[PDB]
Amino acid sequence: DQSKAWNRYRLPNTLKPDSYRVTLRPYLTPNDRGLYVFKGSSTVRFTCKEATDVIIIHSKKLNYTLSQGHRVVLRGVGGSQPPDIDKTELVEPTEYLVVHLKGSLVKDSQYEMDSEFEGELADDLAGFYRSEYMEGNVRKVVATTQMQAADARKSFPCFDEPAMKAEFNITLIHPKDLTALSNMLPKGPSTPLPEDPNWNVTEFHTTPKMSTYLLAFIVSEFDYVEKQASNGVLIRIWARPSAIAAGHGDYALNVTGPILNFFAGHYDTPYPLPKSDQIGLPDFNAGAMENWGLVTYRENSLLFDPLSSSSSNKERVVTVIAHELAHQWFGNLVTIEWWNDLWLNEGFASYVEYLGADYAEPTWNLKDLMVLNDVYRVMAVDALASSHPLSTPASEINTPAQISELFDAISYSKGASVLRMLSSFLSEDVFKQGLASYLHTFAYQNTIYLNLWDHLQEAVNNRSIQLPTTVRDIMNRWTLQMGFPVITVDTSTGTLSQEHFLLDPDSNVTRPSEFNYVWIVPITSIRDGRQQQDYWLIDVRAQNDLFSTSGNEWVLLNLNVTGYYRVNYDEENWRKIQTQLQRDHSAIPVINRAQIINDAFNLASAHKVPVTLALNNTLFLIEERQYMPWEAALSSLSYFKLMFDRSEVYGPMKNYLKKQVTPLFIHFRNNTNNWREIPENLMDQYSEVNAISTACSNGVPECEEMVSGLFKQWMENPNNNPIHPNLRSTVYCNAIAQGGEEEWDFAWEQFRNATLVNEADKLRAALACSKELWILNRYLSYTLNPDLIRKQDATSTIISITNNVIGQGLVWDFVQSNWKKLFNDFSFSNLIQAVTRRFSTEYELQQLEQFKKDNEETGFGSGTRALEQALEKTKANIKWVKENKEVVLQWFTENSK
Amino acid sequence: IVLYVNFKLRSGVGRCYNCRPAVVNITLANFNETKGPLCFTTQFVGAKFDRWSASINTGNCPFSFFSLKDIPGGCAMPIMANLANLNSHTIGTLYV
Ligand SMILES: *[C@@H]1O[C@H](CO)[C@@H](O[C@@H]2O[C@H](CO)[C@@H](O)[C@H](O)[C@H]2NC(C)=O)[C@H](O)[C@H]1NC(C)=O
Ligand SMILES: *[C@@H]1O[C@H](CO)[C@@H](O[C@@H]2O[C@H](CO)[C@@H](O)[C@H](O)[C@H]2NC(C)=O)[C@H](O)[C@H]1NC(C)=O
Ligand SMILES: *[C@@H]1O[C@H](CO)[C@@H](O)[C@H](O)[C@H]1NC(C)=O
Ligand SMILES: *[C@@H]1O[C@H](CO)[C@@H](O)[C@H](O)[C@H]1NC(C)=O
Ligand SMILES: *[C@@H]1O[C@H](CO)[C@@H](O)[C@H](O)[C@H]1NC(C)=O
Ligand SMILES: *[C@@H]1O[C@H](CO)[C@@H](O)[C@H](O)[C@H]1NC(C)=O
Ligand SMILES: *[C@@H]1O[C@H](CO)[C@@H](O)[C@H](O)[C@H]1NC(C)=O
Ligand SMILES: *[C@@H]1O[C@H](CO)[C@@H](O)[C@H](O)[C@H]1NC(C)=O
Ligand SMILES: *[C@@H]1O[C@H](CO)[C@@H](O)[C@H](O)[C@H]1NC(C)=O
Ligand SMILES: *[C@@H]1O[C@H](CO)[C@@H](O)[C@H](O)[C@H]1NC(C)=O
Ligand SMILES: [Zn+2]
């Protein structure tokens, strides 16, 4: 009944909260029913802004103690007189506690509501929840929180929308021998509980005005390491005592303060709090969460062993720390009005993470990785017709499933990509200047995307920056409509044309656009290696002699891929570009060498160039040593693997990659003094790993000897691991694939007795590389036993099994038979996306259409859009294998000789 | 001449592992503070557990290893508590 307010998903405008006090008490031992529980109480003070005879507040999985026959007590403020409560009810679909009143509240009068409640402290990584670990033979239980997006309501009743900002007075009641942590510092030292001195009471300073999704409460036996930042903020890194004593927090300590100070100076906006805690939880869903003053991490995003974690693990830590600290401005100080503008939080933090990580590790040149890790990662999905705009109409985002669906590559990686492009056309100094104004103006308030254009417009006006039109009109093209253009260059005439790039030209684009899928595009270009003047494309088609060539001249568009567009050239320019790559590839910038590879493979898939042109662009890689062009190639050819690794085409494909990678493999064997050293440059270290992994995947026998001998050497001396962490992931998987039950059993025990999570992660993925099907079935049964694989790792491990060609059918059959049970008990989106990406036949399509029909009434929640994208990709794959199988088979045979 | 240097970390739950040790026991083997300085082989007996060790630096002294109180016109070489690869705390001084 949508006529009733409590059956609608958005809160009424009638009540606004002002402040809360919440007291929570986790019981870290099971009760007689076997449950871990927390007991709690709250008072919210709120103002009536419009007269109403109902209070609607959020409540999820909370059981209420009855006071005076009702779930709440309602009190007046300043002499206001509340009506009697007629009835209270819980409405589960919309997650409401509804308090029905015998009369209306009074406009502008304040009121206070008291509640007393209980909840499960579940192993579900949501709300107020339990995380577990072993300390010797003793299992420790931690109470910890995850509120974003809509789970604060699961710890205490609140007006759980991000624009319902308020201040919070937190009290935690905890065992006397455990520390309690929250957003703020304690108001004073922890006192015994009068009723039972085995418990203590800790009360925390009032928070700033804040969104409910940023609250955090933690009770643990954790120790910590401490350092005071250059801006006076106290930084602590919290983890399991054994991890802190070993030093696994020391790298996070070294970087957290400096990065926070860097962002404060960069944006001319102080971090407004006395301390920022960073805490690593054994059980944690999303990697990290930006709670104001109490940032929570997955262990593999915070802890780091310098002798056993890899350079990619180190890059992960500093990147996630920089990402969460970015949210302290973009997300905590200034917050989205509603979840449909999520990119204002996550796109900014995905862009700004590279500035902070570059500051702490300037020798890594991480900013260049944004093209592979963000631009090309998201253009894969944004080329579908089942994509969505950066900013989605707010009327369309209502349910928690719809909200969770937006924590996706569009909000993160495309948000980051347009900010990369937006911070390139106008100066970064000009950019940061407009963002400082924005942060100052909306501090402790909420924003929509139109507020961002205004403050950037002030910065361009004040900096005398010339633009083809307003910041507003340029960036709405990239924000209010989905997708991106392909820019097609005719270099005989210098003509540019743009159109909406789609993976399948027969896809049905049904979402309308008020710009009819035309963009305003900043064009950078180089000629023969020299950068030309900038150009702005304003029409669908235009001419400038910047794009005209004669003779031996070649031009490229999108230097270093700062723009969010793909480029196609005429037949002559392509052939000159390919000639340049053969003669001297160094004349083309390293990022644009990856652009040439990645665009051609995507253009070919869209029937805009011949697939043999895309493949010919990979011929020079036999003499390529840089990480990035190889990684763009291996990434684009992972589609070819997915389409062909069950078919006769796979042999020749592996034959080609063997021929292309073998010189680079021999080079690294030499350059590393037989794998005894690792390169100094970070990109060179990643190139080495890609060369080894590609060599072993495609059957270079020197690699297969190398990895199995190392792993045999490890098994003979288990306490002295002879494999450098950079190679562990590739060495472990290939040794397991080549090995038997003994290699698998050894790595399984090493996973169970692991003390570093960075090490368990490598073993957990590698165990899915078994070629025995009975082993993969046993491993799949393990992934759903929480005593064996943590619930936070179940999907991640199932996906590693589906990436195994032997596991593909096992997991797809598992998904089809157990969907109802699984769903009623975990990223359904990522599982659907991974289990279906091999689909290239009408038979796989009818299973998918039937999988939809069979489960339409349970629904798919936040997997709903991944299902539609799987349907669109599968249809395109059927056509693509039809049109390309023989051409690709023959090309690989001819060029692997 | 023997210089004993020991320290313990803060105890119980919720401790700062890298902060200055809560307990320090610097003992010069036959020194009495009111009797003044102690005037053959210098010895060092520093703590060593996990990543924490005790050291003695050279300070101003032109030599490298007598009072725990200032010796006017002398050189004070600091006694340190070091956490391998992270923090170093001056926990004492040996004046000469
Ligand atoms: C949360 O705590 C704050 C601070 O302890 C409370 O703010 C005080 O509230 C009273 C009554 O409104 C005022 O007279 C004081 O001046 C306030 N202090 C400050 C510093 O502003 C707030 O009322 C508490 N909220 C709840 C719901 O308990
Ligand atoms: C394009 O990106 C490359 C980095 O991949 C930039 O080349 C670097 O430029 C800086 C400054 O000139 C040098 O210190 C680096 O050593 C160069 N690295 C490489 C790989 O050559 C280049 O400057 C960028 N071009 C523009 C104009 O953005
Ligand atoms: C809350 O009440 C429901 C309904 O009786 C019950 O199933 C659930 O176990 C209760 N929660 C706790 C933590 O006991
Ligand atoms: C608990 O309270 C007691 C008594 O005030 C105090 O000695 C102790 O430090 C407190 N413990 C914690 C974890 O705060
Ligand atoms: C932390 O920084 C100090 C000083 O640069 C350094 O000695 C130490 O090795 C660093 N630790 C880690 C884990 O990077
Ligand atoms: C632009 O200039 C005006 C006047 O100097 C100033 O008030 C405003 O804050 C400036 N905006 C930015 C973003 O610099
Ligand atoms: C790929 O290279 C071969 C070898 O020269 C050439 O014949 C073919 O035309 C190329 N394909 C395209 C379309 O570039
Ligand atoms: C590395 O290559 C050089 C030149 O080919 C050769 O002299 C050297 O022995 C090689 N080292 C090894 C064992 O890879
Ligand atoms: C201080 O050190 C000396 C020598 O090691 C020892 O005899 C004495 O008991 C220590 N004092 C304390 C309080 O432990
Ligand atoms: C230290 O010397 C003073 C005399 O200066 C004496 O009174 C005191 O007992 C001495 N301490 C010891 C333990 O010898
Ligand atoms: Zn984020």
Numbering used by the authors:
A (entry chain A): 66 to 890, 896 to 967
B (entry chain C): 302 to 340, 346 to 371, 385 to 415
From the publication, what sentences describe this entry?
The coronavirus S-protein is responsible for both host receptor binding and fusion of the viral and host cell membranes. Its ectodomain is composed of the N-terminal S1 region that harbors the receptor binding domain (RBD) and the C-terminal S2 region that mediates membrane fusion. We find that an invariant set of core interactions defines the interaction with hAPN across all the RBD classes characterized.
RBD Classes III, IV, and V are from viruses that arose while circulating in the human population and they share important features that differentiate them from the tissue culture-adapted Class I virus. In Loop 2, they all have a deletion of two amino acids that allows Arg 357 of Loop 2, the last of the absolutely conserved residues, to form a stronger salt bridge with Asp 315 of hAPN than what was observed in the Class I complex. In Loop 3, all three classes have acquired two leucine residues not found in the Class I sequence: Trp 404 and Ser 407 of Class I are replaced by Leu 402 and Leu 405 in Classes III, IV and V. The sidechains of these leucine residues occupy the volume filled by the tryptophan sidechain in the Class I complex. As a result, Leu 405 makes the apolar contacts with Leu 318 of hAPN, a role played by Trp 404 in the Class I complex. The sequence changes in Loops 2 and 3 lead to a small re-orientation of the main body of the RBD in the Class III, IV and V complexes. As a result of the twist, Arg 316 emerges from a different side of Loop 1 where it forms a salt bridge with Asp 288 of hAPN in the Class III, IV and V complexes, which is not possible in the Class I complex. The GGG motif (313-315) at the tip of Loop 1 in Class I is a GVG in Classes III and IV; the presence of the valine residue (Val 314) leads to an increase in the van der Waals contact with hAPN.
